[PDB]
Copies of this chain bind each other. A is one copy, B any other.
Amino acid sequence: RKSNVGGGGTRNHDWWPAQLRLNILRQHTPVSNPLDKDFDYAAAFKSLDYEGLKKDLTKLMTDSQDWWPADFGHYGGLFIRMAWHSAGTYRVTDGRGGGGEGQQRFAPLNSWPDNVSLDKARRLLWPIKQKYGNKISWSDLLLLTGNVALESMGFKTFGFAGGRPDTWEADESVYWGAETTWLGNEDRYSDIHNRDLQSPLASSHMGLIYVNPEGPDGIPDPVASAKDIRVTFGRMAMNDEETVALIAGGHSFGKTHGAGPTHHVGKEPEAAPIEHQGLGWANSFGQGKGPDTITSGLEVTWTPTPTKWGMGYLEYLYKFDWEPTKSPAGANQWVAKNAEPTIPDAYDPNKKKLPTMLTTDIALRMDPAYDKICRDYLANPDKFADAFARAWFKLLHRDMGPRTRWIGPEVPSEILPWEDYIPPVDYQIIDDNDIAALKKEILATGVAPKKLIFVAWSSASSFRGSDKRGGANGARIRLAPQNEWKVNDPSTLREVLAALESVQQKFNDSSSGKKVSLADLIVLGGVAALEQASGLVVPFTPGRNDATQEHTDVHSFTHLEPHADGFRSYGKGTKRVRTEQFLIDRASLLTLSAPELTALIGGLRVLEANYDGSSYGVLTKTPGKLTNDYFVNLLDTNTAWKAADNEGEVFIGYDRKTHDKKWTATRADLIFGAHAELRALAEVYAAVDGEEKFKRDFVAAWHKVMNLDRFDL
């Protein structure tokens, strides 16, 4: 707050809300990580007594703590909801969210309206975390706790991979929406059965995982509700069959909590008093825990056996007629008509209750597509147990990346369809000699070296580190849909692919156990051509393998196509986001620092990596040679810039004295001479003494981008 000390007062984001900020390129630095400079989590997790941990977790399941009693004497439901919220913030649009980094323990996820009582679920795990030390991460423990919960209650899981490391601060790269009040949704829509949800959002309300459990805007309309679910689960990469299996297999266990009115519930953890030690939502109704618990405000128990696996959910949903009703907190729900109390009380073994359900649940039976799927699962209970295991596995591992980052003994042998699988290498990798020889032979194809660089950059810059999907490995720029991407210049892309293919056959044809993939050739062309342009030895690591179309879902990769790509002078801004805002977002996705971003733009520009051959930002008289001309000419004090039109995207550089026309540029260029912090970076590379340095930084930054997905390393 604006209090008179270090940390306080009005900030820059206060005076200039529209201004571009580079904070997301400065996150997750070592300084804020307490671990030892050489800590390797993968190695520490492998040394873990994994079955020891699982037993410990199984034990915790029936270990009721008086401070947060276990419902039914078993914490599984709570732990299943914990892990499904950790994982469920994921959106396929930008790949952000999910449980890959355990962000549920930080703001704002820790204090979301959907995350009530999940604070207590995490505190229940501290003793076990304390024991395993740094060999298990909160990121992995949160999810494995949900697996163990399912296995403890008789459900057979599909697998589990660990390796997720821990983070130390809140991640500022995610846009969760623009609304300023919790549960607000006014801005992401643009109401009834026909409103459109704003990209990249995958949730209908701020502070919610997917949908309103009472119904859209609190209206219990289950068909209108089913339409929200399809959309939100679609943006989280789940189809109809997987959505039904998740909700049913999930609400197959536990209960909701809404024992009394919600005014009785206090501050969220980030606003809660310091003596509460990180727990929020202090409840003044009754005991405030156990049976008097208040989480969502809904009082629903779905099955006759909440702590045991079975078909109660789909069975009860299809056997009773349901009528709307209200909860002890005023929330919209449903209850069964003409039915005796068959559901157990969480605290009283002598009581049983009437079946209840949620609007979102009823929606699964009322939507014609969901109905059909639900009846198929009733008709074959085994297909259901299998679909849910599979969808649960997908839920917890969809933001984990290539199987090469998957660790542990429960890792599945079976390749999954959503995996983006690349076949391991099974031949002799090429050596320093084939490499030198291959460079030569590529360049000698007569393919314009600007094409070789453009395509290698197009192949790599496709990675996004949030998700860990994309990149040069697999060479899917050759497959759909990346080959018709406009940003990828498909006519060129093909000329380059034809050339690399021919080179590929002559090598693999020379017999021997040595082979080269196309993914490695595409990078190698950039490498050859870059070396030609700088005179510097450009590093190169072989080992990529080619990928097939079957493991390349066209729909999946539809989300990876940029709207605007500044590294390539493509696209323009929107009414809500400026061109330069899209570039900073893309740099974040490629894990680039601010200086790395700066080097790459100057280099790619003098090297002609513009998607359509425009001359925007080619501030060089020698296109094709890697010099520091871009920077020297941008900061050149005798050039002036006027906008070239009204849109404000292309500009003209002209001589102050003379007024002669010199150059053309976009916003992705001028921001580097306009933004004070970026300009300081450009000044380093534009100094009389900075070219040698710049060239080194660019080849480092280039090689970095070329290996962004090489987890197999």
Contacts and interface: CB of A to CB of B under 8 A. Distances in A.
Interface of A: 1-26, 29, 31-36, 65-67, 94, 96, 105-108, 110-111, 123, 126-127, 129-131, 133-135, 166, 168-170, 172-180, 187, 198-201, 206, 269-278, 574, 576-578, 580-582, 584-585, 588-589, 593-595, 598, 635, 637, 641-643, 648, 651, 656-657, 667, 670-671, 673-677, 679-681, 683-690, 693, 697
B11 A179 contact: no
A207 to B, nearest CB: 10
B274 A667 contact: yes
A131 B637 contact: no
B7 A23 contact: yes
17 contacts: A1-B17, A2-B177, A3-B577, A4-B200, A5-B200, A6-B175, A6-B589, A7-B173, A9-B177, A26-B26, A33-B595, A67-B656, A106-B676, A130-B686, A134-B687, A269-B676, A273-B643
Given A126-B683, A173-B7, A66 B656 contact: yes
Given A3-B574, A6-B96, 17 more contacts: A1-B18, A3-B178, A3-B578, A5-B582, A6-B24, A8-B577, A8-B581, A10-B177, A10-B179, A11-B172, A15-B111, A32-B593, A110-B676, A131-B688, A133-B688, A168-B677, A277-B670
Nearest to A94: B6
Q: Which 4 A-B residue pairs are closest in the complex by CB-CB distance?
A: A2-B178, A133-B689, A6-B585, A9-B175
Nearest to A200: B4
A15 B110 CA distance: 12
Contacts of A589: 6
Nearest to A466: B6
Q: How many identical chains are in the complex?
A: 2
Interface of A is mostly: loop
Contacts of A667: 274
A108 B15 contact: yes
Given A108-B12, A271-B18, A577-B4, A684 B34 contact: yes
Contact of A7 (B21, B123, B681): B21
A169 B677 contact: yes
A270 B16 contact: yes
B674 A278 contact: yes
Contacts of A683: 126, 129-130
A274 B674 contact: yes
A679 B29 contact: no
A657 B680 CA distance: 59
Given A5-B582, A107-B676, A697-B34, A16 B271 contact: yes
Contacts of A272: 674
Contact of A4 (B6, B14, B576): B576
Nearest to A182: B15
B3 A581 contact: yes
Given A34-B595, A34-B598, A278-B679, A6 B174 contact: yes
A32 B28 CA distance: 12
Nearest to A599: B34
Contact of A677 (B20, B106, B173, B676): B106
Contacts of A187: 2
A162 to B, nearest CB: 18
B105 A676 contact: yes
Contacts of A690: 133-134
Contact of A26 (B29, B176, B651): B29
Contacts of A106: 676-677
A10 B176 contact: yes
A31 B29 contact: yes
Contact of A680 (B19, B168, B273, B681): B168
A637 B15 contact: no
A169 B593 CA distance: 13
A482 to B, nearest CB: 21
B178 A8 contact: yes
Nearest to A279: B674
Given A277-B641, A637-B126, A585 B5 contact: yes
